[PDB]
């Protein structure tokens, strides 16, 4: 079944798929951008996990008034990096 239009054919699609797999799949999951490292390298996530569990609990307890306030608190914590690093300090 050879000679299936071998005019720069299967080799081109092979190179294209190799390039797209190398650039998109393995590269993205293998290394991290310098913007991400500031979020990934938190030394202690106990406080953030406690806040998220607390907002889940207050949502469950049918107290939607405080859920919005806790979400705003989390948004502000994730916005300002100084407050994030201060809040994430170990012990």
């Amino acid at each position: 079944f050879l000679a299936k239009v071998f005019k720069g054919g299967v080799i081109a699609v092979y190179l294209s798929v190799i390039l797209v797999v190398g650039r998109g799949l393995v590269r993205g999951i293998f290394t991290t951008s310098p913007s991400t490292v500031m979020f990934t390298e938190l030394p202690n996530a106990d406080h953030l996990l406690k806040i998220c569990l607390d907002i889940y609990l207050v949502r469950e307890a049918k107290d939607f008034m405080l859920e919005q306030d806790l979400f705003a608190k989390l948004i502000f914590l994730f916005r300002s990096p100084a407050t994030l690093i201060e809040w994430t300090r170990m012990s």
Partner: peptide, 28 residues
């Protein structure tokens, strides 16, 4: 020495010991 908290023992505690105190000097 009066500002730092915790003592780095394991590798994880050493990699994340960054604080402001050691950056309080002019680069030159």
């Amino acid at each position: 020495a009066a500002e730092r908290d915790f003592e780095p023992v394991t590798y994880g505690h050493a990699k994340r010991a960054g604080d402001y105190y050691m950056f309080k000097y002019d680069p030159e």
